[PDB]
Design a protein around this nucleic acid. Structure first.
Ligand SMILES: Cc1cn([C@H]2C[C@H](O)[C@@H](COP(=O)(O)OP(=O)(O)OP(=O)(O)O)O2)c(=O)[nH]c1=O
Ligand SMILES: [Mg+2]
Ligand SMILES: [Mg+2]
Ligand SMILES: [Mg+2]
Ligand SMILES: [Mg+2]
Ligand SMILES: [Mg+2]
Lengths: 268, 1087
DNA sequence: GAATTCGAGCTCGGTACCCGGGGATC
DNA sequence: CACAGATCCCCGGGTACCGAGCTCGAATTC
């Protein structure tokens, strides 16, 4: 078909709608950096950078020809190219195709919708198809490399560690990992701790020997990661940079991640 | 000396010496700021070059011309001056009371002394002879009068003879609250019993009135406002000049005249040089019977035009503040004064009054001599008083009949007169044409809440400010003299801003000469404007036809023209015009206006014939015989007349109204309108036989006469205006709405199929273009209808549209009414009700109220909007795409790619987006305007951008605008400083708080609000081109912003720490390969 | 004990009118 | 003192919702 082509028929689409299920409106005023290896959905909430990768294998058909393209999600500044994948926006939806057609400085992407009928066919809701134009100038700053040490968590675990963290700039927090399983997310007047294995405070992870004590000055982590309603996931630390960053990737239906910048005051 | 005293300075020996201190050249640098002040005791002198003279010394020599004969009583004419006067152009008519005790020694004849015996009113005719002698003829006789109903006065104040009524009117004046009518007797008020008819209705019967001859017409203003306020006075607002013009058939307020032998043999009685009331050469004492109109002469006499321009300096602590007349240190420094000849249009003298030394630059002197213009006579003064006294002495001695200038009523004359009255206490009542007791006054709008204009009334001097003449003959955003000069004269002038005059004036005479050059060049431009437009000739045509003098024509408005024309007609027919206004003083309307049919909005590429009625409402008034005198509200007055044959009957405002027809009583408004419509038709009969530059001026002159024609209608429908009748005005509009619909239904019924069109017009046979025919009105307005002729060729469609229009006008409407095919659009974009663009057949673009023709916007948005509409209309392959846009409903374009032609239509927008951010952005392209249009206190919504900037200008002591000025302003970017300043003078600020003015925003380099200006560029595009998209401004807006290049950055204070954290950038700030290789580095870094 | 929910309320701006005011058009 | 008329679009500023979110707080309810 048309040159770059991303199709989600049913039964792999159900996974992608499930990924967008919790997120609510969060990733609607977003940026969609499509290309090889898939689509990256980037947004800024509260001053932090949140990402949602969507691999090329993770579509019923993903096909790309040309340089990567980047779309604002708000088509005509209200609607959204991801609003299709919402929780209950279109009840009877089955399928979406994203067809891109143009030349490298100017591509446009069109999104058609397909709802189930009886007797195995689909009505195209041509009242609500979307058309976007490739940005025609953009640059994003995506995370890179791999973390220093990453630990997997759960809903109750992650809920309580987010409870431990601060309120405003007065009280900076710190994810130190001590020797032989002293994972700790404290602040002055609240502190929580886990065991790191390679019951109920025994988190699993890898490269657990890599102790530190990271420090954050900006306490928007709680708001940020609560909006996305993360169900517990990876907590990845990145420190071989002048500015350490911590990434958080829910293990629920989605892989929605959020990088938070830990100020340069890195010590063990 | 003179019988009557001369109230102008013929001599002075002490005055108030104000002058800047920098004028005293050899004095230490610290006695230089400020001004001198304080009384000095020497006659005021003037230094013209090397010579020197007293200002007020006429003598033989002189530094400026003089046309005066007397000067402070001395008679400076060659002995044996006695020019014979048989014909005298008259340009102004004064009136002024004259007391027979005051003219004892004046040595008149009996027949004028008895015409002023306690008192009389004297009608002074000012003018020239064919040999250039300034005449002043005094017309004795001519006393005003009003009517009161005989029975009504007989009842409300028991009356048996007229004399008993004269007695009672005297009796009532002698008891007045403050003793203004001392000695008034029963003989100042002669009366008779006349047999007149009120003019409001057909049923009215001719009653018996008393016609009460007042003298000293201010007593008539009392005896009209305070005498028995429950009786109805009829014509007590008609001044003595109008009585003079009308009572004498043939007389005009502007035209040649002639002295006659008179009633028995009585002659013009030439006054003696001492008994002169005016500054004229020869003077006479006539009565109305010694005068004849002398038709056959047309030409204009030798009258003089002064074209002055003052320049002022501010001399306070802040010499960058703008001058203020009340401040004794903000003084006039220069007065340019050009002296043209009005007949030959030849500049005769170029005078420059200058406080202190002024050496005009040689380049300017040589440009003058190169163009043939006189050499500048620079007159130097020491003090401002001497300079202004010499200017007023020139004005009194030369006596220019016409004065002009640019903005001379809002700045120049108010500045000068405020000086001469506040500061120097000079009586201007004698500096006009009368030697004293004349009007020399200015009026400005001053929160009056109706006043249309700031006036000026000097006696015997017609001030035509070219500012007001040009605001109503050219649509410009800015009416500064430089913009007007470029737009009319094609003359890129250099302006000197008042902020740069102190720096210049402080330097030697050579920079003061530079100021004097900019002063002279301003007045030379204004003289060029005056002689391009020649306002005196058009305004005198109007004054001649109306019956008012020329100054009332320039100033008093459209109603007194109609009232005087109607008054002439009424007095002939035996009618009288009641006073109602004598007792008298939100988008609300008085009655129902005209119908505006609903447009089938959109881009119409088929022919659109535009019919419309010629002179619609005047033709209705004439066709249907509408008047006051023909109206009957009650169906009895016409109970002896056939319906439909002797009278029309129409439901107006749900009130049945009977307008009897002519052959029963001719309308008075019909005859009035005849005269004015003939005048307009005569102007239009010279448009096809004139220059292109002359057809444009003639177009504007016929448009002015059109306004006076439509004001006959308008004069009926003015509430609390003179002699209104909203039954006539509402009838006019009711018939207008009926005719618009009658025409639409006729076109829809008769010519629905091509066979019927061909049956009426066989020349349609060669006009059938290939589509399927139809002929549907797709729009209309008060008189026009836009007939979308499908299946017909645009080629001969106007030639048959003329025949259609004659067919319709013959079939439907009465004879004076006439529909006529005036255009044919080969393409039309019916945007909204009063909005459309369209290219007339094989020709010009007509833009009607779509904000390219509106003075709001900035030249940037107008330039790009014009570029877009030119694409739509002229550039084919965008008219194809645009006409293709209608094959889909608008919302389908939100999904589908727009047709492949329209891409260039967004290239313009894209370019404009580029052009709006570019950091040269000369901000004269970004200057919005708005008219003030009322005192800033008379607003209720005081949150307007031009009010914001008005107060910013008054806060900084800059030049505060005037009530109908245009207030230019930029929208500056919202910056934390601007935020703090607005709250200081008290988020996202309003556009009324980001409202700087351009002079400031350049001086202080305040940067423009790119967001606003582009959102309004797209807003103008959306307002126009919503017609392509089903009139959906929403959809249009969305589809236009899809053109614009979208851009995304990680912001600074984010990009900083990312570049610090070893993230490379990929996109703008690197070569394309470098971005690709870094993108490789990232993708393999994540993978 | 503790993952829902949805009442509870609460600030969110799009949308709708409304109004004055500029300034066009008959 | 001063004084033609009306209609009508669009913009700016104001105000009044209210559908939609979306964050705690004691109710269920694992
Ligand atoms: C322009 C204008 C029109 N009108 C009214 C009166 C008109 O009869 C009616 C139609 O307007 P117009 O077409 O503008 O004027 P017109 O048709 O009377 O004159 P013309 O022959 O040049 O076309 O609108 C005014 O009252 N005042 C005006 O200033
Ligand atoms: Mg000036
Ligand atoms: Mg001026
Ligand atoms: Mg007309
Ligand atoms: Mg016409
Ligand atoms: Mg017209």
């Amino acid at each position: 078909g048309a040159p770059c082509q991303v199709v989600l028929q049913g039964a792999e689409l159900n996974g992608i709608l499930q990924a967008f299920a919790p997120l609510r409106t969060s990733l609607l005023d977003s940026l969609l950096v499509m290309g090889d290896r898939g689509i990256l959905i980037h947004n800024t909430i509260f001053g932090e950078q949140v990402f949602l990768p969507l691999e090329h294998s993770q579509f019923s058909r993903y096909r790309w020809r040309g340089p990567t393209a980047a779309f604002l999600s708000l088509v005509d500044q209200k609607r959204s190219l991801l609003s299709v994948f919402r929780a209950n926006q279109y009840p009877d939806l089955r399928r979406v195709e994203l067809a891109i057609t143009g030349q490298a400085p100017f591509r446009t992407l069109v999104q058609r919708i397909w709802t189930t009928t009886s007797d195995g066919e689909a009505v195209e809701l041509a009242s609500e198809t979307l058309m976007k134009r490739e940005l025609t100038s953009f640059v994003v700053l995506v995370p890179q490399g791999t973390p220093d040490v990453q630990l997997r968590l759960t809903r109750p675990q992650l809920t309580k560690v987010l409870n431990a963290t601060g309120a405003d700039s007065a009280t900076p927090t710190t994810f130190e990992l001590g020797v032989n399983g002293k994972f700790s997310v404290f602040t002055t007047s609240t502190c929580v701790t886990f065991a790191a294995r390679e019951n109920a405070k025994t988190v699993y992870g890898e490269n657990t020997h890599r102790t530190f004590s990271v420090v954050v000055d900006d306490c928007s982590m709680r708001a940020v990661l609560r909006r996305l309603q993360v169900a517990g996931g990876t907590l990845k630390f990145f420190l071989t940079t002048p500015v350490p960053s911590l990434c958080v990737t829910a293990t629920g239906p989605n892989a929605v991640s959020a990088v938070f910048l830990l100020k340069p005051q890195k010590i063990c | 000396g003179p019988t009557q005293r001369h109230t102008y300075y013929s001599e002075c020996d002490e005055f108030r010496f104000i002058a800047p201190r920098v004028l005293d050249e050899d004095a230490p640098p610290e006695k230089r700021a400020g001004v001198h002040d304080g009384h000095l005791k020497r006659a005021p002198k003037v230094y013209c070059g090397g010579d020197e003279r007293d200002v007020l010394r006429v003598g033989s020599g002189g530094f400026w011309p003089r046309r005066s004969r007397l000067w402070g009583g001395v008679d400076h004419a060659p002995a044996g001056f006695n020019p014979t006067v048989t014909v005298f152009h008259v340009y102004d008519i004064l009136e002024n009371v004259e007391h027979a005790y005051g003219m004892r020694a004046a040595q008149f004849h009996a027949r004028f002394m008895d015409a002023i015996t306690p008192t009389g009113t004297v009608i002074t005719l000012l003018g020239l002879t064919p040999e250039g002698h300034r005449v002043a003829v005094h017309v004795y006789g001519t006393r005003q009068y009003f009517y009161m109903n005989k029975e009504e006065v007989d009842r409300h104040l028991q009356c048996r003879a007229p004399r008993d009524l004269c007695e009672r009117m005297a009796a009532a004046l002698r008891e007045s609250p403050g003793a203004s009518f001392r000695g008034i007797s029963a003989d100042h008020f002669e009366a008779e019993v006349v047999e007149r008819t009120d003019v409001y209705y057909y049923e009215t019967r001719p009653a018996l009135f008393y016609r009460v001859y007042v003298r000293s017409g201010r007593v008539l203003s009392y005896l009209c406002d305070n005498f028995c306020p429950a009786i109805k006075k009829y014509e007590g607002g008609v001044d003595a000049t109008t009585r003079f013009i009308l009572d004498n058939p043939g007389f005009v307020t502007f035209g040649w005249y002639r002295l006659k032998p008179g009633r028995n043999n009585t002659l013009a009685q030439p006054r003696a040089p001492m008994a002169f009331g005016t500054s004229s050469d020869v003077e006479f004492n006539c009565t109305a019977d010694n005068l004849a109109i002398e038709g056959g002469m047309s030409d204009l006499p030798a009258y003089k035009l002064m074209c002055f321009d003052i320049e002022c300096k501010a001399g306070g602590e802040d010499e960058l503040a703008f001058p203020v007349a009340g401040h004794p240190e903000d003084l006039v420094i220069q007065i340019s004064c050009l002296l043209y000849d009005l007949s030959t249009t030849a500049l005769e003298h170029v005078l420059l009054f200058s406080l202190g030394s002024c050496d005009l630059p040689e380049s300017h002197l040589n440009e003058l001599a190169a163009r043939g213009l006189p050499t500048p006579v620079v007159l130097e003064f020491d003090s401002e008083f001497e300079m202004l006294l010499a200017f007023m002495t020139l004005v009194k001695q030369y006596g220019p009949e016409f004065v002009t200038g640019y903005n001379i009523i809002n700045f120049d004359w108010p500045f000068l007169l405020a000086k001469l009255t506040d500061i120097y206490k000079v009586p201007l009542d004698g500096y006009g044409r009368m030697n004293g007791r004349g009007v020399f006054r200015v009026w400005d709008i001053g929160q009056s809440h109706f006043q249309k204009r700031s006036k000026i009334k000097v006696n015997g001097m017609v001030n035509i400010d070219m500012y007001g003449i040009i605001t109503d003959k050219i649509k410009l955003s800015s009416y500064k003299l430089n913009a007007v000069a470029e737009a009319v004269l094609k003359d890129k002038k250099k302006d000197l801003s008042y902020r740069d005059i102190p720096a210049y004036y402080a330097t030697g005479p050579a920079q003061r000469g530079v100021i004097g050059e900019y002063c002279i060049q301003d007045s030379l431009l204004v003289g060029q404007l005056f002689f391009k437009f020649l306002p005196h000739l058009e305004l005198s045509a109007v004054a001649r036809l109306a019956g008012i003098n020329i100054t009332r024509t320039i100033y008093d408005g459209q109603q007194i023209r109609v009232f005087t024309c109607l008054l002439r007609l009424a007095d002939q027919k035996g009618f009288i015009l009641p006073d109602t206004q004598g007792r008298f003083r939100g988008r609300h309307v008085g009655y129902q206006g005209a119908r505006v049919l609903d447009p089938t909005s959109g881009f119409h590429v088929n022919p659109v014939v535009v019919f419309d009625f010629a002179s619609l409402y005047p033709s209705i008034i004439q066709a249907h015989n509408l008047c006051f005198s023909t109206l009957s509200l009650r169906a009895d007055a016409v109970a002896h007349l056939e319906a439909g044959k002797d009278y029309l009957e129409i439901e107006v405002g749900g009130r049945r109204l009977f307008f009897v027809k002519a052959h029963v009583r001719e309308s008075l408004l019909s005859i009035l309108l005849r005269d004015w419509l003939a005048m307009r038709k005569q102007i239009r009969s010279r448009i096809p036989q004139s220059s292109p530059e002359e057809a444009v001026l003639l177009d504007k002159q016929q448009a002015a006469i059109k306004v006076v024609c439509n004001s006959v209608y308008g004069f009926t429908g003015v509430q609390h205006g003179l002699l209104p009748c909203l039954h006539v005005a509402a009838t006019v509009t009711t018939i207008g709405r009926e005719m618009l619909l009658a025409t639409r239904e006729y076109v829809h019924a008769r010519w629905a199929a091509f066979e019927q069109l061909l049956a009426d017009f066989p020349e349609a046979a060669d006009m059938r273009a290939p589509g399927p025919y139809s002929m549907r009105i797709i729009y209309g307005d008060t008189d026009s209808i836009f007939v979308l002729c499908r299946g017909l060729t645009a080629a001969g469609l106007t030639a048959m549209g003329d025949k259609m229009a004659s067919h319709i006008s013959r079939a439907l409407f009465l004879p004076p009414i006439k529909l006529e095919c005036e255009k044919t659009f080969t393409k039309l974009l019916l945007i909204a009700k009063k909005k459309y663009i369209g290219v007339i057949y094989g020709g010009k673009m007509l833009i009607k109220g779509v904000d390219l023709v509106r003075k709001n916007n900035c030249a940037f948005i107008n330039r790009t909007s014009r570029a877009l509409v030119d694409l739509l209309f002229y550039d084919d392959t965008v008219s194809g795409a645009a006409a293709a846009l209608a094959e889909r409903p608008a919302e389908e374009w939100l999904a589908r790619p727009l047709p492949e032609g329209l891409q260039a239509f967004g290239a313009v927008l894209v370019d404009a987006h580029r052009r709006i951010t570019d950091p040269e952005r000369d901000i004269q392209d970004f200057v919005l305007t708005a008219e003030l249009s009322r005192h800033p206190r008379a607003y209720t919504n005081k949150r307007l951008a031009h009010l914001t900037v008005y107060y910013k200008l008054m806060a900084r002591r800059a030049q505060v605008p005037s009530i109908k000025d245009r207030i230019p302003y930029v929208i500056v970017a919202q910056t934390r400083e601007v935020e703090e300043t607005v709250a200081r003078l008290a988020r996202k600020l309003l556009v009324s708080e980001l409202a700087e003015d351009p002079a400031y925003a350049i001086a202080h380099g305040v940067a423009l609000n790119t967001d606003y200006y582009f959102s309004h560029l797209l807003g103008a595009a959306c307002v126009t081109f919503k017609a392509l998209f089903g009139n959906n401004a929403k959809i249009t807006e969305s589809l236009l912003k899809r053109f614009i290049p979208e851009v995304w950055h990680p912001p600074d204070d984010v990009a900083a720490r990312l570049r610090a954290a070893g993230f490379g950038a990929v996109g703008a700030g690197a070569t394309a390969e470098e971005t690709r290789r870094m993108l490789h580095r990232a993708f393999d870094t994540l993978a």
